[PDB]
Subunit: 398 residues, 2 copies
């Protein structure tokens, strides 16, 4: 074992658990008791005041629940223990692969136990309906899944197992995150899927255990209407949109356009025509003067388009965005759409810059806290803050 | 013979120590009499004089005769934190045989940490020491509950059929077995309880956690307080707890001021003054608290069916049931922001609250019977900017109903007198004026008091809306006014906003658009010179 530490003057997380559904608790009891039967967790009394929430989910179509522990507070508190071990360099080639397959490797941590003095911090309670029984509180004896240090301890151990693989097929890029293994290969999908099987066999041989396509990923530009005969309202709306665009693309001039009924058309003036066309060309080009500063976290802002479509902006500072894209799925449920959208944003973010950004969700916090776990299939959990202001950005983007 | 749960202090603390304000001999005799028998019971031991701490003891009649009490107010400030909802009557399944057993002061049966006993001395102005849980330590309930769980686990294991609850001193045991059988099984339970040193002292009604259990119904024993011109302070520290507990049973209880008046105060010699305002609030709260609740036992084989009704202006109902005319639980909901809202959004928030409460109580989300028409809900959910969901539900027809009063058009209207508005405000003397500019040029600038920028932006729209016909177009340079208006609200603290709402109700085709500020767009230039 190796020591585990906290940022000085930081206490263990004390975050109360939100209520759970009857089937969820019924299955969670089975999972947790089976775990204790195999020595994975040990029950505790009231001397441990810490607690982190739990919720059992279903990752895939397989009919078997699996539990998640929101270690957002524990990861934040134990952020210092990451600085002792940095994964340098992060693979920049995954961004270019033709196929990246995500293989769950959470089960690896079950064999490497934790440093004892930190066991107390990983505690959770599986609450009972109507608060009849007080609630069985356990502690993690083996390493957690979502804990920041969970792969940090296993990094050296695992990379030993990967040594043959990186030895014999360099073009594969294998990169890991809190629970997941991303394997990339810019090959034909036929043999990409072939080496996926061999990697699975290699992993299980030494005791461990939609498709994702970065190349097809594209940056959606912003377009401007060009109706054959616009009317006075159209120019007003177009100007109102464009003057916002200067905060992104500085090379924008509209002084001709604003040169000025709204039942009729107003034919555009020629100098306005040329200037506007020049601006249209400028807008339809790759964003400029933007890069990544790894010293600051990343912000993901989602805005709803209200017809079974969504748009998002991924930025590190305001008015300067790294990745822009839309999420669409054609009358269905609504919370499911954000949850799928949040998951797809975070998968892309993990691939491209290797960390989950902070979300600014378009939903009341009360609403999210009830039905976010119903439709989440992912081991990780991103930090989110809630937005209660409708801007013009939603109309601006699409 | 029962394992002691380890307990430690909060870090960087070496208390407690408070000089007990010396008592008098008549009561001291009572303290001695209690102490001798308490010791011979192996409960409290006369420590060695090397222990340096002390805490006060008072004598209470236990009625409104010199019952022992030790004030652990300063002791609680150093204890390590421990894990600390309430079981609602609505969540008790039917059980044809029911009994409620009370533990005979079981806190005097679960040992306290022998290593922590140094911090709970007991002087009679003869230092003593607790070895079992204190009778008033806020840390005691947690360890008591834990010990009860650990001792009950085997008996529960060997009997899966029975269901056993325990909150403070009651052991709600229920089973479907016959009474002739159930008494024998409960006798087994009592003997097993005695095995671990617990003592059990020694009927259509049953009093369980303050809920009166009945053959097919449940109710709350009416909860009332002692009344006096001035109340004993320590009892006030009790009555706050009783009111707190009643808050879960019956809403509309706030004692925050009463709690502050206690918390600031730390003495008993002076007769503690009580405010008239908070006292009257307590009295009026109690008057409302005179209401007998009801309900019936939940049967999981039948689905919950809730229903919300719109009383008026931010008052709703929370009727929950599984059969007609048998309320499982009834509640009411009111506005939370109190500033800007709309009825459909209020309905969504009410559904959210009901779902949260239902998952808490029974665990399965219900089938709401909302009143709103489906077309209206679909339109609002497809057009509103944020994300909202309602679980499976059906409309129910009632004379009052919820609808969006008005809509803001999505296409500027042919012939409609497009009306331009603008607004600005100053700071030294609130010298900002408002008005509107129109296609034909009609306008009016009427001086305004308490001129505020957001206020002015609002005022610009209303000035034009008052002198506008049916079909209107309004171009505003405020994103804020547009945002407030286009949220389709129905209640706001502003009679200005409400006046706009009542005005816009009359209009038939109203269309709003926005412009950038401090730019020449061929409109407001007529009164661009308004302020500068």
């Amino acid at each position: 074992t190796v020591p585990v530490k906290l940022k000085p003057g930081m206490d263990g997380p004390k975050v109360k658990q939100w209520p759970l559904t009857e089937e969820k608790i019924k299955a969670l009891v089975e999972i947790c008791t089976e775990m204790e039967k195999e020595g994975k967790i040990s029950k505790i009394g009231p001397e441990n005041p810490y607690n982190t929430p739990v919720f059992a989910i279903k990752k895939k179509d397989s009919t078997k629940w699996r539990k998640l522990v929101d270690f957002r507070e524990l990861n934040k508190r134990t952020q210092d223990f990451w600085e002792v071990q940095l994964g340098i360099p992060h693979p920049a080639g995954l961004k270019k692969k033709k196929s990246v397959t995500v293989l769950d490797v959470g089960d690896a941590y079950f064999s490497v136990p934790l440093d004892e003095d930190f066991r107390k911090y990983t505690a959770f309670t599986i609450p009972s309906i109507n608060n009849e029984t007080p609630g069985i509180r356990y502690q993690y004896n083996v390493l957690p899944q979502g804990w920041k240090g969970s792969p940090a301890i296993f990094q050296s151990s695992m990379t030993k197992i990967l040594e043959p693989f990186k030895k014999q097929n360099p073009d594969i890029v294998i990169y890991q995150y809190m629970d997941d293994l991303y394997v990339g290969s810019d090959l034909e999908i036929g043999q990409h899927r072939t080496k996926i099987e061999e990697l699975r066999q290699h992993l299980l041989r030494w005791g461990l255990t939609y498709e994702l396509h970065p190349d097809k990923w594209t940056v959606q530009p912003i377009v401007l209407p060009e109706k054959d005969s616009w009317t006075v309202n159209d120019i007003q709306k177009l100007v109102g949109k464009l003057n916002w665009a200067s905060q992104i693309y500085p090379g924008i001039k509209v002084r001709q356009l604003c040169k000025l009924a709204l039942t009729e058309v107003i034919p555009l003036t020629e100098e306005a025509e040329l200037e506007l066309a020049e601006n249209r060309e400028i807008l339809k080009e790759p964003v400029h003067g933007v890069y990544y500063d790894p010293s600051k976290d990343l912000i993901a802002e989602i805005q709803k388009q209200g017809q079974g479509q969504w748009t998002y902006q991924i930025y590190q500072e305001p008015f300067k965005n790294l990745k822009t894209g839309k999420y669409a799925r054609m009358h269905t449920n609504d919370v499911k759409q954000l949850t799928e959208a949040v998951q797809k944003i975070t998968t892309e973010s993990i691939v491209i810059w290797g960390k989950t950004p902070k979300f600014k969700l378009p939903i009341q916090k009360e609403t999210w806290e009830t039905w976010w776990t119903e439709y989440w299939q992912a081991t990780w959990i991103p930090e989110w803050e809630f937005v209660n202001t409708p801007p013009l950005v939603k109309l601006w983007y699409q």
